[PDB]
Amino acid sequence: ADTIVAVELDTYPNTDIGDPSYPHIGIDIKSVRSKKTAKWNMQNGKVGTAHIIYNSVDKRLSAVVSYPNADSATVSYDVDLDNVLPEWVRVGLSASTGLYKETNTILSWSFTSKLKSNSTHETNALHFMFNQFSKDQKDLILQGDATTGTDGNLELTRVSSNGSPQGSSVGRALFYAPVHIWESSAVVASFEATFTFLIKSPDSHPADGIAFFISNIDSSIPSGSTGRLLGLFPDAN
Amino acid sequence: ADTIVAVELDTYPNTDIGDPSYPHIGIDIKSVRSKKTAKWNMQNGKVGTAHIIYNSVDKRLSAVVSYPNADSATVSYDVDLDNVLPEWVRVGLSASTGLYKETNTILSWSFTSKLKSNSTHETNALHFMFNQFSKDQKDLILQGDATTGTDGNLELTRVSSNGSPQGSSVGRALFYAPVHIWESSAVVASFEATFTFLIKSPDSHPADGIAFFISNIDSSIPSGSTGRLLGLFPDAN
Amino acid sequence: ADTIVAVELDTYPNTDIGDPSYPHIGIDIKSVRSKKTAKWNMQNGKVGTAHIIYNSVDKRLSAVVSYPNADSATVSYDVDLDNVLPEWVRVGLSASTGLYKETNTILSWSFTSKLKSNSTHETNALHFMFNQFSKDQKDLILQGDATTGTDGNLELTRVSSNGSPQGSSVGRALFYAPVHIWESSAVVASFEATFTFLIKSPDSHPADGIAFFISNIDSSIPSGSTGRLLGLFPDAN
Amino acid sequence: ADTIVAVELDTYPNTDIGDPSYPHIGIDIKSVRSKKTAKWNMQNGKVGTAHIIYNSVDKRLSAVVSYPNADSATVSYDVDLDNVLPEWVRVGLSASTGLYKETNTILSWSFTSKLKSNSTHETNALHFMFNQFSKDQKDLILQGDATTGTDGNLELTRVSSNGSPQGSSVGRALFYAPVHIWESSAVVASFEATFTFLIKSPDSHPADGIAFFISNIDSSIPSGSTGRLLGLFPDAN
Ligand SMILES: [Ca+2]
Ligand SMILES: [Ca+2]
Ligand SMILES: [Ca+2]
Ligand SMILES: [Ca+2]
Ligand SMILES: [Mn+2]
Ligand SMILES: [Mn+2]
Ligand SMILES: [Mn+2]
Ligand SMILES: [Mn+2]
């Protein structure tokens, strides 16, 4: 089905499916059951920043999530992405709410993929940066309940006009152009993703999380992937 | 119809339609009849480089075409692009051959659009760089006879297996993602395009030229735009 | 003496020396008597952003100063910088206070110089970005009363421990490495400067202003260049 | 003494000091006795490209050396650079010749250091790119026999007017500005270095090699560091 590789900012601990007993960041390879996790001291109502990095030489997918004036949370996992993802992929953001809710607002998003060939001065690159979103953001593919424009932000899950987050919501935002992650002549290949988010909930138990993902080009929201499955996976296997 | 703004590398002088009596570079705004031209000392069989620049403050579209070890050709035209092009556009390359022919090979292509808002640290940007093309270049829209892959280059017009350019050929290559050229909150907006080309013909009178263009998102090759019309315009008005 | 080219954010109108009757931005070429000015609706206590741009093709030095939620101020002047500045220069920021005062705080500073040769794929570039300053900022040359470190900012003029700006202060910050602005093989040359500032004064008549400048490598603060002369010029000619 | 961390392109095997029996690339931490090496199929007279990368999250210094149309050589070593290098350093290139010789020509050099803070949108960066060198390259510190200008290249070791490399030569080129490699508020820190070189010798046994290095700011050529010690180390310990 959809080949998924994602870094989840999981706000709700579903221990029955492997989530530890606290908010956390995790590296998911084809499954919602993180291959590796790290405790995340989430701050309700605060704007945070997540950094995802990876290069073909070291073969390690790492993420660093921090908030201003606080210590960072870091998680790493050794994975040869070439062995998992197709040649052409699409990058994006996903978020959902189940019985519990939260806003899943994106205020800025930037990505950069580089492929360096063995040729003299040969380098292929893509780089997008959104520091503000428009009502008609033509270079983005919105799936589910995701919308842009509301005071220049990307609302991944449904937020009522009064500012209250809705439950049972799922939405994803993908960049319009496919990204070339593997090249036969490439000696070095790497990508860098960064985004500022704002998880806010009037409850003491927000859910379910935000996730940066990389999938096959024709990826779409799996059925009933609201809640714990973050709009990325079809089941909890 | 198609809103076209292009910088043409016109190899053949069609004096009847306004072309001066020699190879040249020109700034075309909605018409093949350049609004401004500059003599271009073209070098058959040599790899050249073209630089196109524009910013919303100065409001001047400029281009610089040079070859190694030779002097450059420069042409500028004052134009408030906002008054000519839609909010969302698509960028690309076009080329054609008429009774006379030439190869219209692209070896590298890079583009960069920036939109700076009046907000603190707010900047939206897009940047692509192709230093090599693949047979299946999914992030490119090929129209007409254009193909990629042949020793990693983009062949805009038909070139036979033995390396001979075909006449009456037209082809264009557009980047997959739409580019946002105007933003309501932008204080400064600008774009930079650069490409290395290789015009080669066994004849002493090559034709018809290469052109970097910016059009409305759903642009396609006009009918009978081979030859002098460079695959951009439908007629010579 | 010192070859100076600067974009001044002049907060105090010294009409006797050519300043119009209001706060303004101006392009100074070798003299404090701006060659071109534009009214600037300054906002005391608000963080602003200034954008300075220039390229060798268009030959126009432009600046755009804005504040969040307000309209921008823009000023342009046609000047072939090659005819004014030496081959190697140094870039920096300057600020002063006279009988009237104000804080001249810099919160971020970035610069980018590019020189493109007529050679295939040849480009020389420099780019620095300061989004925070340290007490020991070794890559900066501080002259006068300028200091860094205070909550990660660059204080160009003296600010007492209680936060009050001192009068008769002058200070400048220059990047450590000389910048190459002209190259004999360059077909295109350009630079981009951007900085966020914070002009704040307890008085209704702040003075004297901030200025981004480009000088000869061994530039230093002229004598008695406090006040109206912004630490750039020795006299009011 | 000088804190040295370097990636050596060692053309001559000095087995007595730990060099394997063939040309190779190696990661040297404070000693010429590489902490890790990889066989390098060097090509006399061909222009090559070396890529050095490192980030504070993964803590792995890697290098990739390739030539057009050939397979690459890669070597990696896990090292927390913070534990080895001072806060402020200087980056550069070094090369030497002993009883055997070779040209140690640099045709292009680029470096990029990034420091991302835990603050929203805070990033400090430096980036230089030399695609050509001038006779008076003011932003470079030349030590030893290194010179720039000769057809726009950086000659690290002495090359006679007729093009013949001299033995017993040592020269280094350092960037003028100190680089900040550690910051107390940084969540992620990383640097990327790339350079095209040309090792050419009329002999079948060229020596001694090229090396990209990072040292303490006031670094200079150790005495008698010609030959096998590549101008970086004082002895073979
Ligand atoms: Ca969960
Ligand atoms: Ca023509
Ligand atoms: Ca004044
Ligand atoms: Ca050796
Ligand atoms: Mn989880
Ligand atoms: Mn024409
Ligand atoms: Mn003034
Ligand atoms: Mn060795």
Which two chains have the most extensive interface, and how many residues on each?
Answer: A-B, 29 and 29 residues
Please work out how many helical segments of chain A DSSP would assign. Answer: 0
Query: What's the overall geometry of chain A?
Result: globular
What's the total count of β strands of chain A? 16
Helical percentage of chain A: under 10%
- Please write the CATH class name of chain A: Mainly Beta
Structural class of chain A: mainly beta
Oligomer: 4 chains of a larger assembly
SSE order of chain A, as H and E?
A: EEEEEEEEEEEEEEEE
Strand percentage of chain A, roughly? Answer: over 45%
The bound ligands are: calcium ion, manganese (II) ion
Summed up, the domain count of chain A is 1
Rg of chain A: 17 Å
- State the distance separating the first and last CA atoms of chain A: 14 Å
The major beta sheet of chain A can be summarized as: 8 strands, antiparallel
What's the architecture of chain A, going by CATH? Sandwich
Output the CATH topology of chain A: Jelly Rolls
GO molecular function (chains A, B, C, D): D-mannose binding; metal ion binding
Organism (chains A, B, C, D): Canavalia cathartica
Protein name (chains A, B, C, D): Concanavalin-A
Function (chains A, B, C, D): Glucose/D-mannose specific lectin.
